[PDB]
Design a protein around this ligand. Sequence first.
Ligand SMILES: C[As](C)(=O)[O-]
Ligand SMILES: C[As](C)(=O)[O-]
Lengths: 520, 520
Amino acid sequence: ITASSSKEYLPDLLLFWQNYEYWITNIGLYKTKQRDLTRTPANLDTDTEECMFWMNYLQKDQSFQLMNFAMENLGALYFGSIGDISELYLRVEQYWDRRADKNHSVDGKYWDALIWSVFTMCIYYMPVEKLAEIFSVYPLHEYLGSNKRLNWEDGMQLVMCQNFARCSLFQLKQCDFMAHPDIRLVQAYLILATTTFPYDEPLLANSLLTQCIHTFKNFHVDDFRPLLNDDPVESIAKVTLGRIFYRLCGCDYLQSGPRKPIALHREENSTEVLYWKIISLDRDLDQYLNKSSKPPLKTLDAIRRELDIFQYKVDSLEEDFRSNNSRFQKFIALFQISTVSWKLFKMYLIYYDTADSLLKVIHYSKVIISLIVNNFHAKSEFFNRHPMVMQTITRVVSFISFYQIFVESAAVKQLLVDLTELTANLPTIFGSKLDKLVYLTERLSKLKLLWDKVQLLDSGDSFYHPVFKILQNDIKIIELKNDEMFSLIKGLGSLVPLNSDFRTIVEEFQSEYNISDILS
Amino acid sequence: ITASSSKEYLPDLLLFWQNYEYWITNIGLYKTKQRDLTRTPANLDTDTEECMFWMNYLQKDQSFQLMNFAMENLGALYFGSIGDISELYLRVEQYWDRRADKNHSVDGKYWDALIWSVFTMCIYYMPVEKLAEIFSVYPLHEYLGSNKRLNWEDGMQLVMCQNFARCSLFQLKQCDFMAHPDIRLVQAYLILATTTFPYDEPLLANSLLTQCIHTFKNFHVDDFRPLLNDDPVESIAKVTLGRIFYRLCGCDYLQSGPRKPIALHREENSTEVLYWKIISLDRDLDQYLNKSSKPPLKTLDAIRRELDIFQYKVDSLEEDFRSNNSRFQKFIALFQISTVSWKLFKMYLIYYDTADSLLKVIHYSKVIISLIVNNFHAKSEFFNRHPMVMQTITRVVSFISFYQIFVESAAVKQLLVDLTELTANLPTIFGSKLDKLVYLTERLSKLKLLWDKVQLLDSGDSFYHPVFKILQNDIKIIELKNDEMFSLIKGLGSLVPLNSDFRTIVEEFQSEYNISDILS
Ligand SMILES: C[As](C)(=O)[O-]
Ligand SMILES: C[As](C)(=O)[O-]
């Protein structure tokens, strides 16, 4: 092993990105939640106490203002799940007609759970200004015991959203949903999944998704196309179930990981078709992240051809600037397609170093930045709260940071500054996940520093560097935090398992920048 | 269509048994529970109130008497799930050490849920005399408001069992089990599944099973064999998980039906191996029940060869009459193997009219009767409470009743009287399911009467008879009660769907003997 100025390490280093992105930026950052059950409080009360307060807090006038907000801005998010929101107003009325009742039917409780999941979505997306005009923060501190000086914009809106989600589940529990499979469970879940709920509670969300898969399959409808011999009411139920199935598929893919072992496997719902096709393209690409095989060039070209077809349909979508439902829909479709585009070219770059790959990568990252920044012109700012922008930004700023470490490029260097800057401006509704991403970004930059300030080595057979070991350790540490063997051993009984300057740099860096800090 | 004395209808009539047995005696009788959600009370309280009483009712001295009973009689039922019961005593101690605590950890609550599922099993199997010596019925009526004149043997033991099951689930809910996957959920379920719980609550049980499948898979252990590089504690956890997996598979098969769409797919645990092999043989056979294809003769012979191998191992099991754990184990293995034997020959008879088939069918039904009657010599009477005897008796008495209708045989005629008699003597712990089976039996007998008192017709192309139509209608009615399209339509909104003397006999019989009466 001697000194080296070689570079035949880069190819395998870019191959290694795929895995890093999967374990660190995806699994570790969003789906890894440490669970020490011996120090976790049980819900003796089963949230009865908590939801007594939140449900009394919400007043009738306010609940209809949440519906109006949904009815006017969020159609692109809820249509696939609940369809037209008009009959849901009747459900809010009935919720209030029965709010005083001492006896409720499971049926009624399912509708309540559903509208409450909608209220949750509403709280999650509503601009803090509109939220302030409707609700008073003080009754919250009054009950929570939090600082009365903290306002809605200080993390209180996120707290109200998280509790509205909890009460939506509380009402499902009052339905004894496990003994009464109903399509409303899937619909409620679908609506909660438009928020960061699946990120706040990955295991709970994965269990709930499994229940939705069970609920769906429980209908035994494998063909959603209306049949001549069908009662129109039955044809409508199947077209609706079909849209739900596809939104479900969307969640199934987004919640993929070791903690989610069970897999699902015209006009406005022509958009529903477009939304699924774009996500399936995203899946077709990211399936290679944790795989060791390389996608064949001809496979990427095939995906590219479909991408151009969908980019055309996405661009043919007329967006009515007067209608905010239309605008959000355009933004969502445009962002999804750019994300898939960014990924396609990242893979062309990484696997085949294809001509123009980097240029394309730079361009779709800017398109992505541009789309987010375009909403900073308020009345659309809340569009940026969509979980997809957090996911997309995470992949982009992380890969660029990593690419910046090994490859010299002023264009990429400037892109990183813009990316780093935009990240800091993302909606605070993304909570601690946003701080963790900022942290992950600084750590990667600090990792570039180290790469510069230390000489690469070569045993003539393999290369060596502290940065390599550290990156390799990151994946190992997060893989280990996802091994359930430990919780298995702890659940079965009281048995407990027993079993160079280069090493000083690795440990030094890690105790200063613990990768475990991106976890939950 | 003219009169007929033909008999070339029997072959297809026996083929038709397979389906009848699947839909009527299996799906309809044990896995069909009508659910009108608009008239079903929600659990606003989430069982808090109910389990406050039951958990205070059970006293420490009594809880250890349940463990002793389990430790002394039920090892064959719980070993595969919880292994050796010795460390579970420590858990009962801890349950009492913390019974007064106002704060509990999720970990502690999981152990509580587990021992309570065990208490449930205990109540389900304990001889009413031993139960009476331990508990006082009066505090129950006092709280339930039921007739104070009703004693333990009057359906009160079954009520205490059903509520112990409810509180076992109540404590799992306090664990927020969906957010904390733990092997104890599977183990608790496994223990509850040794009782009739899965029959009382088919949908809830199927949802819980789905959660166990998710919990299991969540460990990502596909190989249970200990490895050289393994920590002994880790090797032990895998051997244990392996036994759990197989017991699970057992439940997965037993709970098969349209309401369970998600599928799992040395010494004392050498018995565990034997238990699974015999059940998989049972599955290999009954998979043809609702299939239209016929099992190839060579396939039945293959199953027969394995059956003789296992019948030898089952017979090589030494049973210590001094040890009741040993005796129950012998009974269980002997009963399972006879059940599989009975089914093998029923299929030889039905599909190929094989030589001696009927004789063999008659003999294994007597072996089966004999095994149950053999326990009426008390101190083993409670062995008959095993869900398997209810299932097996159901298949036997039903097929014999049906066979008695079309084929003349004094031997079978006497067997039906003995079967009909034994049914009436089965443990009352089987509740309303027992009355429904007795009812189904009378209906089939009344159906023989009708067959005798009415002439068969022949259109020269097909045969006709009221009995045929009625039997065909039974399957159709139960298939319809298992179509979830109705509940789908009701969950999505307010839309509601619109869409001869021979016919007088069919309707006459049905309004007098409604097949729907075997449902729950
Ligand atoms: C227009 As293209 C995404 O095939 O370069
Ligand atoms: C001894 As045999 C069950 O093959 O007849």
